[PDB]
């Protein structure tokens, strides 16, 4: 039968009030014969009725995929309220209920360390700028790169990795042309986490 997966909001969306966080209830392996799917959302117990259901997206394995989105309040998610999604389809032995919430555990502030490129890498034409973020909890975090107000987009960030002391860490790699780095340009690693003041901090990296 159809499976159900429940996803949390994006970390940036819960930390920034100008953004809209939302929990996502994905239903996969929905048969062609029984496509209709009903959604029941429950916040901490009480039922809400403000969630929207996106149209079915036919997949490349002879099944449909239904998605329901429930916008959440920033405080409710961060304070640990529980979101429940009940999926009822005319082909399940019983409606499936899934539940997610914040991780529970004392939050810990992320330490941010910018790392210059290795001298051995200056042979190449592009150079790797590194941002180490370690010691934070929970794993919900957002990392970005900018250079004097302008977003640097050619970057990749590893997923959060559980560390030996219970906290999390990750690395973010920004790739810039070596000439920009040798020219003394200033790059910035913007990190967003609930344990930071104003949910924000940033560190700069520059040749000297």
């Amino acid at each position, epitope marked *: 039968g159809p499976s159900v997966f429940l996803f949390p909001p994006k970390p940036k969306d819960t930390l920034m*009030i100008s953004r809209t966080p939302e929990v996502t209830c994905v239903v996969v392996d929905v048969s062609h014969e029984d496509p209709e799917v009903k959604f029941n959302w429950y916040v901490d117990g009480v039922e809400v009725h403000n969630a929207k259901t996106k149209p079915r997206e036919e997949q490349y394995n002879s099944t449909y995929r239904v998605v329901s989105v429930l916008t959440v309040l920033h405080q409710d998610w961060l304070n640990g309220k529980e979101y429940k999604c009940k999926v009822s389809n005319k082909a399940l032995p019983a409606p499936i209920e899934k539940t997610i919430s914040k991780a529970k555990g004392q939050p810990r502030e992320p330490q941010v360390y910018t790392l210059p490129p290795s001298r051995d890498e200056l042979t190449k034409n592009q150079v790797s700028l590194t941002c180490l973020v370690k010691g934070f909890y929970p794993s919900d975090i957002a990392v970005e790169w900018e250079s004097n107000g302008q977003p640097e987009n050619n970057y990749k960030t590893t997923p959060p990795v559980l560390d030996s002391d219970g906290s999390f860490f990750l690395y973010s790699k920004l790739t810039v042309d070596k000439s920009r780095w040798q020219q003394g340009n*200033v790059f910035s690693c913007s990190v967003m986490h609930e344990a930071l003041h104003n949910h924000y901090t940033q560190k700069s990296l520059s040749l000297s």
Partner: antibody
């Protein structure tokens, strides 16, 4: 505009505690982070801490951690800074400040209270 | 933490002359989060400039800011009498937020 009005001058003995209030009137309260900045007589400005009233999670400069508690009451639109175990080196003016952009975006200090002189005198 | 160093300590100029105030950062910082404030005696700081160069609303055009990296400057093209106070630079890109020592402008007579 927003109006930040703090409580009056305080005189305390060492070791005692003080709690300065900062009522915000005019604009929306919960979404904007309120910070506390202090200034010793004749000296410069030092950021003590801050809080976003909507989330209730304060943050502090390392030198004040374990000594300052910052809170925010949404029902009365009032931010508080409480400093326990007062030292004479805490004698300073304390300002509350915000804050044009909502929480999550880096911002400057645009609105300021009138200041609260805290004297630690025997 | 980031240390802002302001120069000079006191600046003695006459009304009508040009003023330059420097703010050296201990390390490179994004210019998008450098602010300048003015403070008169017995008053709270007033925001002059943010983003290193953008002028706050309702600030006379004689105040301008510039710089990047570790070197930022606040220039008053033509000093008015109410421009003689103390000026602070402040970064707000990373906690803790930090201020320079301040520079005092006094009237040269």
């Amino acid at each position: 505009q927003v109006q930040l009005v703090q409580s009056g001058a305080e005189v305390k003995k060492p070791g005692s505690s003080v709690k300065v209030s900062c009522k915000a009137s005019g604009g929306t309260f919960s979404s904007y982070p309120i910070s506390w900045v202090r200034q010793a007589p004749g000296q410069g400005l030092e950021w003590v801490g801050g809080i976003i009233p909507l989330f209730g999670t304060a943050n502090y400069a390392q030198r004040f951690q374990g000594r300052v508690t910052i809170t925010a009451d949404e029902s009365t639109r009032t931010a508080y800074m409480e400093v326990s175990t007062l030292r004479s080196e805490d004698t300073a003016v304390y300002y509350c400040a915000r804050g044009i952009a909502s929480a999550g975006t880096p911002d400057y200090f645009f609105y300021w209270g009138q200041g609260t002189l805290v004297t630690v005198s025997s | 933490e980031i240390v802002l160093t302001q120069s000079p300590g006191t600046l003695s100029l006459s009304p009508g002359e040009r003023a330059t105030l420097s703010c050296r950062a201990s390390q490179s910082i994004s210019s998008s989060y450098l602010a300048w404030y003015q403070q008169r005696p017995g008053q709270a700081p007033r925001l002059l400039i943010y983003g290193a160069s953008t002028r706050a609303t309702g600030i006379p055009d004689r105040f301008s800011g510039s710089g990047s990296g570790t070197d930022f400057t606040l220039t008053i093209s033509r000093l008015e009498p109410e421009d003689f106070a103390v000026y602070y630079c402040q970064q707000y890109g990373s906690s803790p937020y930090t201020f320079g020592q301040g520079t005092k402008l006094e009237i040269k007579r």
